Amino acid sequence: TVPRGTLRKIIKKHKPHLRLAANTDLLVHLSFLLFLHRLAEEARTNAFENKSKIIKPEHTIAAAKVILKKSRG
Amino acid sequence: SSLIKQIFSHYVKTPVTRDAYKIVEKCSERYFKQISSDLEAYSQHAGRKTVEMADVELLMRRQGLVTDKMPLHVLVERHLPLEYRKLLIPI
Numbered sequence A: 001t002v003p004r005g006t007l008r009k010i011i012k013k014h015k016p017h018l019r020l021a022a023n024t025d026l027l028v029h030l031s032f033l034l035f036l037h038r039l040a041e042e043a044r045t046n047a048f049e050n051k052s053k054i055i056k057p058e059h060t061i062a063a064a065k066v067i068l069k070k071s072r073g
Numbered sequence B: 001s002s003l004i005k006q007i008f009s010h011y012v013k014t015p016v017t018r019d020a021y022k023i024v025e026k027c028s029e030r031y032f033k034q035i036s037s038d039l040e041a042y043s044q045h046a047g048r049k050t051v052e053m054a055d056v057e058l059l060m061r062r063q064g065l066v067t068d069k070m071p072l073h074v075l076v077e078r079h080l081p082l083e084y085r086k087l088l089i090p091i
Helices: A004-014 A024-050 A057-071 B002-012 B018-045 B053-062 B072-079 B082-088
Strands: none
Touching: A004 A024, A004 B018, A024 A057, A024 B002, A024 B018, A024 B053, A024 B072, A024 B082, A057 B018, B002 B018, B018 B053, B053 B072, B072 B082
């Protein structure tokens, strides 16, 4: 389950004159899911490196830097 | 939103602080901003105003997600629910 409308709106927020063809919002959503997956693996590795039993802001922030770098088009 | 939490927790498989989640949300906003500019580049470069399937596939190839060993349809089958696979991969 997922808010397709929300996707379309998000993209519009950034580029209001971008048109999404009919099912492309679904591939966009997929790329986002894979983004969060990568983020989760990197963050968990950060946590594990600190022997932190929980995921902390700094794990996710360092991980974000790495993964957004991988997410460039 | 709440959804981003469900997904992130689902993938991370361990407990996550409130602040950590807040970061994930911020970074997600960043993600969409960045890809929005890439998708615009693809469209403008192909002289059109729409995002096509091939554009987002190219995005995901550039991101190292789609590769020769790992074609797009495999990611779709693996990661999206039946109702979406039906639209994306009806054959």
